């Protein structure tokens, strides 16, 4: 509980799935290209949750063309359409920063 929870409570998004660091996630991002409003999917491994309620972020990481990319989104952000949980990973950390220096087979997470 916090002092500013009554401010944040009409702004939290329900129906966000439970996901841990290590999971593989689809992120459906609203994109504005002129006057089109399409929807682009970012598929990757969750490497971070930094808590806080309305100010909670998460970071997802993929490998596009030999180049690792990380996106950091606010949880409860309205430019996320929805989040789909592909794969449950099995890790021992919480921040998973060691995946930033691994490539290929060695950057692969288990299946629990």
């Amino acid at each position: 509980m916090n002092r500013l929870d009554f401010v944040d409570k009409p702004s939290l998004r329900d129906d966000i799935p439970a996901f841990n660091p290590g999971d593989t996630i689809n992120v459906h991002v609203k994109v504005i290209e002129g006057a089109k409003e399409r929807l682009q999917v970012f598929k990757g491994v969750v490497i971070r949750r930094q808590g806080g309620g309305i100010r909670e972020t998460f970071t997802v990481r993929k490998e596009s063309y030999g180049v690792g990319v990380e996106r950091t989104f606010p949880v409860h952000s309205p430019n996320i359409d929805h989040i789909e949980v592909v794969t449950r990973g099995d890790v021992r950390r919480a921040k998973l920063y060691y995946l930033r220096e691994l490539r290929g087979k060695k950057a692969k997470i288990k299946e629990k």
Binding site: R3, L4, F6, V7, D8, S11, K30, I54, R55, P74, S77, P78, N79
Partner: protein, 213 residues
């Protein structure tokens, strides 16, 4: 017509607007004020209005200060400040005994916010005034954060006044201009103000309408 209210900085959070942009907001609790005193130019020489804010126990307000709230018919408050007006049209809207709430400000308005900034103690010339300091290597001897020269030579044989030196920093009166009022929550007495507000969380804050808009 410059408006004004007293409140408390409740800290920061973040909110999203209609174009889905993130907005860093400061929560000011623009609490229910009361007037208690009006300055007229025939009595006082100038034109203003006192404002009283904050719940206090009546055993903590001493006898000289209780008699001033007694002459206005108001229970004693904790804080007490004036809103300085222009000379024309003093208090045709302000009456002694009037309660002032958070919703004198509208959404999308602009406000000047003034408070007492955070105390930084005895600060050095690098922190206080942004000096560079000397280098970390190439022989430099024990002057890494020291100021350097403080003047000329035998002309003039003195240091000029207002030379930037070390000393105490903070606890100042700071006004921040042209802050956007993102939301006024009349249910709670809470203004969502875009940006930063001077002071610690819990401190007294004066919220006036902006002159520059």
């Amino acid at each position: 017509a410059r408006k004004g209210i007293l409140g408390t900085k409740l800290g920061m959070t973040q909110v999203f607007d209609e174009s889905n942009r993130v907005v860093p907001v400061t929560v000011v609790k623009a609490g229910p004020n009361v007037v208690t005193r009006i300055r007229t130019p025939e009595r006082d020489g100038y034109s203003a209005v006192q404002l009283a804010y904050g719940e206090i126990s009546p055993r903590k307000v001493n006898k000289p200060l209780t008699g001033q709230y007694t002459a206005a018919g108001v229970n004693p408050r904790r804080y007490l400040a004036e809103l300085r007006l222009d000379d024309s049209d003093a208090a045709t809207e302000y009456q002694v005994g009037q309660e002032l709430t958070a919703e004198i400000f509208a959404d999308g308005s602009y406000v000047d916010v003034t408070g007492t900034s955070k105390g930084k103690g005895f600060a050095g010339t690098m922190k206080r005034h942004g000096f560079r300091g000397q280098g970390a290597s190439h022989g430099a001897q024990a002057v890494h954060r020291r100021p350097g020269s403080i003047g000329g030579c035998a002309t003039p044989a003195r240091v000029f006044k207002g030379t930037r030196m070390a000393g105490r920093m903070g606890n100042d009166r700071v006004t921040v201009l042209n802050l956007l009022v993102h939301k006024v929550d009349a249910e709670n007495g809470v203004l969502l103000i875009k940006g930063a507000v001077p002071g610690r969380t819990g401190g007294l804050v004066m919220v006036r309408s902006a002159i520059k808009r």
